Structures are given as structure tokens and as C-alpha cells.
């Protein structure tokens, strides 16, 4: 069974600039673009786990998407952490890919929000966080997460606590994680790197972000702060991609460099 649902897709306008600002200063994203949209959505969830339900849908531009939601009500600001995290990961991977130090390219799935609406008057408009809260409230429903559909064999390559998948080792992914800490001057590290490998491409989903500021990602269960950063580096070996990038090492690193895998 399926029905039509109409409402607003909610994204962040000028992502790069917003994210650059969020990282550098300490100011949360306060600008959200609303775009009217109609989805065809399955009534029955095809999967659940990691604390949340998943529904197949078609975005009417015909693309296959997945609508996700936590089991019960959550405040907008909690859900926005997932979005802010994903946007950081996309920002970082885009720069990382632009370095062209590896044939393998990293692509985190876009994540946005969807709320149903009978009306379309906010179409194309940019709203503050508070105005977005009011648009959400008017619906009186928890927004859904939306992400493109991803098929293939899903692998967890690195977790958020120093664990490394051995058989499916990719030096590109490990160097990326180290690099995220270097690029953000020690402030955060991206891990829980997991998704699908095909054609020199990693399609990555549900990452974790450790931040040294105890007030930055307060709802995230996967953010272990400075300890999670230390945990990554205790088992990290700088690889040929790290070396080619001349990444400075974390003072917890003790293991010797390795040159298995890419480059």
C-alpha cells in the first residue's frame, strides 16, 4: 500500500558557507530553505534499527528515497543534529575528494527533512530556526529524515571507538578520518564510517562525529568527545594516503605507519 504525501523538503541554503561558519565560529545553522514537494510513500516500514523506522518512497521526480524517523516524538533541535552532522561530513568529504589523493571518492548521502503540509506558501523561502520550529509545530508531527535510496552490500568500516574492519580495509577511509581531525584543527573527528563500496566510490551513511566541545553535539549518543578521538588514534596507523597528505599525528598515536591498501 501507498499514498501521496505533500509538503516541504527542508534543506540548508549555502551549505558550504553555513558549515564553514559553524565550524569556525560557534554559531549553529539558523537558515533553512523550504521547498514544496510531493512523495509517494509506502505505508509499511521495510526496516527498523539504530533506534528508527524506514519507509520506501518515490519523490515524484521519480527518484527512490527512504523516509526515516525515530520511534516517537523528538524535538526539532535533536533531529537537526543529524542534519548538521551529515552536512559537515559532506563538506569534509567534498574537500577531501578535491585533494585527489586517492582514486576512491567518498560520498555521504544527503540528509534532509520532510514535513507534510496542505499548503505551499513557504515554497522557496529561507526561514530561521525559530520559524522552522513554528512551521513544524503547525504540522504537529515529527519531521521525517529523507535520504536517497542506497542499494548494495553495507559494511561498517570503522566504528566510533577505535575498532577497525580488517578484511574490508580501505586506506582512503582511514586517511579521511585522520584528515577530518587535521582540517578542523583538532576539534572533531568523523568515524562510524559505513556504507557501500562500488566503482571507486563509497556511498556512506549514518556517520558519527566526536567533538571536543562538550556542548556542540549534545543529543548524539555516538559523540564520545575527546575520548573517542583518542580511541581512534590509539589504533590508527598512518597509511600511504596520510603520508601523501603530510598529516600531523595525534599524540596518542603509537603504532607504526603501514602501506597496505590504496597507494
- CB atoms near residue 31 (< 10 Å): 15
Q: Which string of DSSP letters, residue by residue, matches the chain?
A: -EEEEEEEEEE-TTHHHHHHHHHHSS-----EEEEEEEEEEESS-SEEETTEEEEEEE-SSS-EEEEEEESS---HHHHHHHHHHHHHHHHHHHHHHHTT-SS-EEEEPP-EEEEE-S--TTTT-EE-HHHHHHHHHHHTSPPEEEEE---S-EEEEE-SSS-B-STT--HHHHHHHHHHHHHTTTSEEEE-EEEEE-SSEEEE-S-EEEESSTTSSTT-TT--HHHHHHHHHHH----HHHHHHTPPPPTT--SPP---S--
Question: In the bound complex, what is the minimum distance in angstroms from residue 239's beta carbon to Zn ion?
Answer: 6
Closer CB to Zn ion, residue 36 or residue 249? 249
Closer CB to Zn ion, residue 142 or residue 184? 184
Stretch that binds Zn ion, among 117-125, 185-193, 201-209, 233-241 (CB under 5 A): 233-241
Stretch that binds Zn ion, among 132-140, 211-219, 227-235, 242-250 (CB under 5 A): 242-250
User: Contacts with Zn ion in 159-188 (CB under 5 A)?
Assistant: 178
| CA 192 – CA 161 distance, rounded (Å) | 8
Question: In the bound complex, what is the minimum distance in angstroms from residue 188's beta carbon to Zn ion?
Answer: 16
Show the cell assigned to 118.
496542505
Answer yes or no: is 140 a known binding residue: no
Closer CB to Zn ion, residue 33 or residue 242? 242
Stretch that binds Zn ion, among 48-56, 57-65, 96-104, 238-246 (CB under 5 A): 238-246
Closer CB to Zn ion, residue 204 or residue 242? 242
Question: In the bound complex, what is the minimum distance in angstroms from residue 241's beta carbon to Zn ion?
Answer: 8
Answer yes or no: is 211 a known binding residue: no
Closer CB to Zn ion, residue 106 or residue 238? 238
Using DSSP bridges, classify how beta strands 105-108 and 201-204 pair: parallel, antiparallel or unpaired.
parallel
Site membership for Zn ion, residue 10 (CB under 5 A): no
Applying CB under 5 A, among 238, 240, 250, 262 the residue interacting with Zn ion is 238
Applying CB under 5 A, among 89, 242, 245, 262 the residue interacting with Zn ion is 242
Residues making up the binding site = 50-52, 68, 147-148, 150, 178, 236, 238, 242
Residues making up the binding site for Zn(2+) = 178, 236, 238, 242
- The residue ranges that bind Zn ion (CB under 5 A) are 178, 238, 242
Residues making up the binding site for ADP = 50-52, 68, 147-148, 150
Amino acid at each position: 500500500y501507498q499514498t501521496q504525501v505533500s509538503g516541504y523538503i527542508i534543506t540548508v541554503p549555502n551549505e558550504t558557507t553555513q558549515i564553514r561558519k559553524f565550524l569556525a565560529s560557534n554559531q549553529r545553522i539558523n537558515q533553512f530553505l523550504f521547498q514544496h514537494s510531493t512523495f509517494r510513500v509506502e505505508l509499511a516500514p521495510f526496516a527498523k534499527g539504530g533506534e528508527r523506522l524506514a519507509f520506501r518512497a518515490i519523490n515524484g521526480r521519480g527518484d527512490r528515497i527512504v523516509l526515516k524517523r525515530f520511534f516517537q516524538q523528538r524535538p526539532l533541535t535533536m533531529l537537526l543534529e543529524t542534519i548538521e552532522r551529515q552536512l559537515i561530513c559532506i563538506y569534509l568529504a567534498n574537500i577531501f575528494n578535491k585533494l585527489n589523493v586517492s582514486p576512491n571518492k567518498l560520498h555521504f548521502l544527503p540528509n534532509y527533512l520532510f514535513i507534510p503540509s496542505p499548503t505551499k506558501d513557504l515554497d522557496g523561502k529561507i526561514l530561521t530556526l525559530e520559524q522552522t520550529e513554528q512551521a513544524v509545530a503547525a504540522t504537529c508531527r515529527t519531521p521525517n529524515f529523507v535520504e536517497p535510496y542506497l542499494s548494495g552490500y553495507f559494511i561498517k568500516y570503522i566504528d566510533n571507538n577505535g575498532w577497525i574492519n580488517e578484511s574490508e580495509f580501505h586506506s582512503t577511509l582511514h586517511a579521511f578520518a585522520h584528515w577530518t581531525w587535521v582540517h578542523t584543527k583538532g576539534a572533531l573527528l568523523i568515524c562510524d564510517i559505513q556504507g557501500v563500496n562500488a566503482n571507486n566510490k563509497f556511498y556512506l551513511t549514518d556517520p558519527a562525529l566526536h567533538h571536543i566541545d562538550q556542548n556542540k553535539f549534545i543529543y548524539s549518543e555516538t559523540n564520545l568527545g575527546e575520548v573517542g578521538i583518542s580511541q581512534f588514534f590509539r589504533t590508527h596507523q598512518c597509511n600511504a594516503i596520510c603520508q601523501g597528505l603530510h598529516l600531523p599525528k595525534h599524540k596518542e598515536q603509537v603504532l607504526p605507519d603501514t602501506t597496505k591498501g590504496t597507494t
